C-alpha cells in the first residue's frame, strides 16, 4: 500500500483504467475496487455524495485494492485538502478554465514549498507511516478538468502548470459549451476534434491526459489513442442499463 | 397511488416482477423503480441496509412508481410494523419454517380483529388518506420465505395460514440445507424438484408463490412456470457483472 | 441534573406533563424541552426514529431541561438497556399484555438483585457521577402500556409487578381492539369506561397511570381526573395542524 | 410532474404560497407538501440542514406534491448546481447585494449558452425524461435575496439580471441592517417602506417578488399587496408555538 | 487476509490481545487496528454504536490489520448473521447463561449442517473469494459471555457446546450479580475465584477463555494466567484518563 | 449557561485551557467537556468531521459544561455563520494571512453594524433567550490562525482588526512554511522564536493569543509564558498513545 497505483501504472509504462461512482455507499465501492480497476473515482459533483458519505467509501476502495480518487464538486483548496487528509489519493477538479485556476488546484496538492497544503494527514500518515512527508507529493495524483471552450482556448497554459499531472476531459460539458448535445462517447466532429487536440497538446507538454467514458468499447479506443487515464463507466448508468436488460429478458415472450 | 401495484397485477391476472436492492441509497432505488418493475424489494437481511437507510429508500421507490417491498432481517412483528408505518407495502420474511411462524408473520400485517398490528400509520395515512383503516389489509402484501427442509416439510400447513398472500422461495438457503451448493438459478435436481413442489402446493392452496432469481432468463422461465412474484436480479450482482464486462471490453486488445 | 424530573413531580405531589416526538432531530427536541414540559417522550414505535437518531435527541432534551423518555418499538430487555445507557431516563414499553411481560419490562430497569440490567452506564455515569449505582433505580421511570382487551383483562396482575412505576394507556390501539375507530381523545363510551377503569385500578394499587393525549384540552381533563403522567401532543400532529391553519389564513379572501 | 408548480401558478395568473423548513427529516416534509402549499422551501442557511439531510427531503416534498425549493447557505454556483442535480427545483440565494452577485446566481441556473451550469442532472433527468435539456431552464425557479441596505441601493440593477425570476425579501436581516430589531412581520415604518419599494421596483421591471412571512395573516396581506411568492411559516416556529399553547391549555385550571 | 488473525494466534500457540471500542467512527478504529492488536472488538451493547455505525468500522479495522470483532447487544441469531455478512469475523454474545443459549449462539455461526446461518455473505465473499463456503466456519470466532451466577452454575454445560470456541468473562456484571461493586480488574475474592474457576473449566474442556480488562497490567497478568483472548482497554476509558492527565499536567503549578 | 466560559476566564484574569477533537461523535465530546476544560475545540479541517457530525457534538459539549468551539476548514463567512447558529460559540479560522482575511473573519462574527452576520440564531436564542441580540458579540470568541511566514509578516496588521479577540498559532504549518519538520511542541529555534514574537505582538496590541499543544507539559509552559488560550491535546493522538502503552504493558514479559 506504499505507492499510488495510478502513478505506478504510469511509471511502469501503462495507462490506468478507473471506475466511477455516483452512488453513495461502501459495498459496491469495495466490490468494484476488487475488480481490475487501478483506481475508483468517487463523483462529488453530479451525485448526492457529500463528505460524510465519501469518507467511508475511500476506506472501502483502498481495502478492495484500487486507488481512491475523487472528482470534487469544485476546485476549492480547503475542500481538496480535507479529502486528501481523509485518504483521497487522486483529485480531479471540475471546471478548470485558466492557468490561474490550474495553479489553485496545484497549490492544494503539495506541502510548502511547492504548494500550500495544510498539514494534518490523518489517514495518509496511517497508510504511509513516518516517511510520509518526504514522499507526500508522489502519493497524490491531480488532474484539471477541461470542460469549456475557455479551457480549450487556454489548454497550453493550463498544461504548463507544475504540480498537476495533467488534464481530464469532461466531454459532455464540452459538447454543451460548443452548442451540441451532451452525449457521452459522442461522435460529433467538433467535439471529437477538440478531444484529440487536448490529448495532443497534453502529450506535447509531457503531461498526462484522461477522459470520462460511458462504455467499455469507447474506453478501449481511448486507450488505443494514448489516453493515460480512462474512466468507464458510472455505477448508476451501468446498473440502470443492466436492470433494464434483465427486465426485458424476464418479460420477453 | 391508491392501490398496491403488486396486488393490482394479481387482481388483473398477471404476475409481478420486482427488483432487489442490497445497496443502500435513494438514487438507484428511484431509477430502478422507474423501470418496468412492479415492485422493488429492499433486502435488510443480506445487506448493510439498516432501518435508518431503508426509510428514505421507501420514499424514493414510491416516487419512482414501483411498490416498495422489504425482505426483513427476521420474522419479528414489531420490526415489520415499524416498516409498514414507514411505507413498506410488501413484507417478505425470511426463515418461516412452521405454521406458527407463518401465523406470527400474518399477525403483524393486519389490524385487529384479523391481526394485532399496532396503530400509527405515519406514511400509509399520507398515501391513502382518511379511508386507510378500512382498506389497510389490502394495501400490504405478505410472503413467508421457504428456505429449509423443515419449511418444505411444513409447506401445506404454512400455506393454510390466513392473512399471508403466500410464500417466497429462497433457493440458495434451500440448496444449502439439502447439502448442495448455494448457486442461484440452480439446476440441481433435488432443489429444482423442491421448488416445483412448493409452487404446486401453493397453487393447490389457492395462494401466491414467488422466487428469488439471479438472471432475466431464469426469471422468464419462472414466470412461464406460473410463479406469481419473481425478483430479478440483485443490484450489487448486476452492477458487479456490468463493471467486470466494461473492464474486459476496455482492456481487450 | 441529579434527579429524574418526573419522579420529582410525583415526589412533590404533582403530575407530570410530557411532550411526544415522532420527528427525528435535535433542534425541535431541545426547543420543546425548554418549554414547560417535565419530560419529552421520543416515539420509536410509530415513527422513523431508529437508535442512531434517538441518541442525539436524548442529549438535546436533557440540555433543554426536560427528562428524556422513550416509547420503545417493543418490550425487549436489551433494546431498553441500550437506551438506558444512552441516557433515556424513562421507558414506556408498548403492548404489555400480561404480568410476565410486565416482569420482563421491570427486569430491564434495575440492576441485580432487583432486576438483570447489564452494567455499562455510559451516559448515566456522566450525569450522576460516582454515586450512580446506589441510586440507579430511582433515576429511571418505567411504564407498561395498556393497549388491548387482554391487557385490560390482566390489569390488576400487571399493576402488581414490582419495579415498574405503573401503566400508560394507549387509547387508539385499545379502541381498535374493542372494535371502534382509533380516534385520539375519543368519546366512545366503552373506551372511556375502560380508560377510567385502568386509572381506578392503578390508583387502588398505589401505582401511577399515564395516558397519551392529542390535545391540550383533553390533557387538562385527564390531569383533573388524576392521571399522573399525561402526554400532549405529537410534534407531527401539532405541526401539521399549525401549517394547515397558516395556509387557510394565508389563502383566505 | 412535468412542470414546476410555482412557475405554473405564475403562468396561470396566481401567486405561489410555500412552506419553510428548518427541521431536518422527510416525514414532516412530505406531510406539509401534501397540504395546499405550491412549494416547500428547505432552509440550509439558518438551520442544521446539510446536504446529506436535504437530499432525502427533496424526494419527500416531490412525492407529497409540492415543488422542492432550497434557500441556500450562500450564493455559490457549485453548491447550487449540486442541489439542482439532486432535485431542487427552486433556489433562493441569500445576501445578493449587487448585479454581479445576481449574475453569479443566474449563471448557476442555466446550461450554456444562457449560463454555465454543469451537466449531470441525476434526478431532473428521472423526473423529466429525455426532453429535459430543452426545457431545463423552465423547470427551475431562481430568486435573489434582498437583505441589506446595499441590496436596496442596487435593487434596479439586480432586477435587470436575465435568468433570475426576481427577488425574495429577507426582512429580518433588512431590519437589522437599517438599525431596527429583526422582528418578523414588522411594522417598523422604514422597513415596511423598503419592502414596498422593492416590490414596486420588481413589478416595474416585470419580475417576480417574494417575501418571508411569520404568520398566515401577514402572508394574506402580502398576497393582497401583490407579492408573487410568499412563505409562511417556519416549521420550528409553528411547532414551538403550537406546543406552548398545548402546554398552556393542559396546565390551565 | 485469508485467515482469521485470532484463530491464527491460537493455531500458532499464542493468545490474542484485542482492543475494545465504545466510540463510533472509523478513524480511531483504523488507527488502533494498526497497533499490535490481533483484533479490535466493537461494543454494540454498552455504547451508542448501532448497525449503521458499526458497518464502516468493520471495514476500517480490517484495512488497519486487525480482525474485526463485535460484542453484540444480545445473543440474537439474525442480528449476528447480519454482522457476519457485513464482515464481523468474531462474535462475543452477552448474557449466555445456559447450554440452550450457547447452542443458539453456535447456530448463528455455521452454515448447515453444523448450524443454520443464512447464506448471503456480502463482505466475506469479497475477502475470501470463491472458496469461502468450504472454509466459512474457520473464518469466524465465537465466544459466549459469562456474566451471571447462573452462567457460572452452568459453565460446564455451556463449554460442552460444539461450534463456539469458548467463553468470554464479563467481570463487572459478574461482580454485580454476586452482590459486589462492578469494579473492572477487581480484587474482590469471590469474583477473582469465580474468574479462575471459569478459566480452569474452559481449559479442562479443551476450549478457549477470554476476559475483559481495564488496564495493561491486569491484561499482562491474565495472559500469564493462561487466558486465550484478552481485551484491554476501552477507547473511551483510555481517552478520558489520558485527557484528565493532560489537564492535570497543564494546570499544575 | 448565560456566558461564554472562555470570555469569563479572560474577564476574571485567567487563561483558558481547551480540548481538541478530531474524532466525530458525542460520547467522548461530553465526557471530555465534563473534565476541567473551559472549552472543547472541534477540528473540522484535519479530521473527517463534517457539518452533519459537528452539530450534535456542539450540543454534547455544552451539556458537559465546556464552551463549544470549532476550528473550521476555512475562513468562510457563511460556513462560520451556520456554525454560530448551530451553537458554536468559538471560531478558530485557519490560514488567516492578511488584515483583509482577518476582517473577513471578524465580519462573520458580529451582526450589523459591527459586522454582517446574518440573523437566524436557532440555538443561541434557545441558550440565551430574548436578550440574545444585545449581547450576541460577547457570546462568541474569534481567533485568526497564524500558520505561515506571510501571516508572520502581517501579524501587527492582523492584530489591529477590531472584532476578533486575537490569534491562534498553528505551529506545525508554521514550521513547514519555514522549511522545518512539522513536529508538534517543537524546539526548533526559528519556530520557537516566531511563536514568542507572535505572542509578544499580540500582547503589545492588547489582544489574546492562543497555541495548539501536543502535550500537557508543553501546555503548562505555554500558560506560564502568558498564552491566553491553550489547547491540549488531540483526542486521536491521546487515544493512540494510550492504546500503544496498554499494548506494551499487556505484552511485556
Ligand atoms: Br475484473
Ligand atoms: Br455515462
Ligand atoms: Br424498463
Ligand atoms: Br444473485
Ligand atoms: Br411553555
Ligand atoms: Br394525535
Ligand atoms: Br391544506
Ligand atoms: Br418566523
Ligand atoms: Br503497538
Ligand atoms: Br474499563
Ligand atoms: Br479533569
Ligand atoms: Br498532536
Ligand atoms: K483493483
Ligand atoms: K415502475
Ligand atoms: K422543561
Ligand atoms: K401541495
Ligand atoms: K494489528
Ligand atoms: K468543563
Author numbering:
A (entry chain A), B (entry chain A), C (entry chain A), D (entry chain A), E (entry chain A), F (entry chain A): -1 to 251
What did the article's authors report about this structure?
Notably, the formation of the overall hexameric assembly of apo‐SwHKA does not seem to require the presence of a metal cofactor. Crystals of WT apo‐SwHKA and mutant variants thereof were soaked with MgCl2 or MnCl2 to afford the holo‐enzyme. In the absence of metals, wild‐type apo‐SwHKA and apo‐S116A displayed similar melting temperatures (T m) of approximately 66 °C, while variant S116C showed a slightly lower stability of 62 °C, which suggests no substantial disruption of the protein fold.
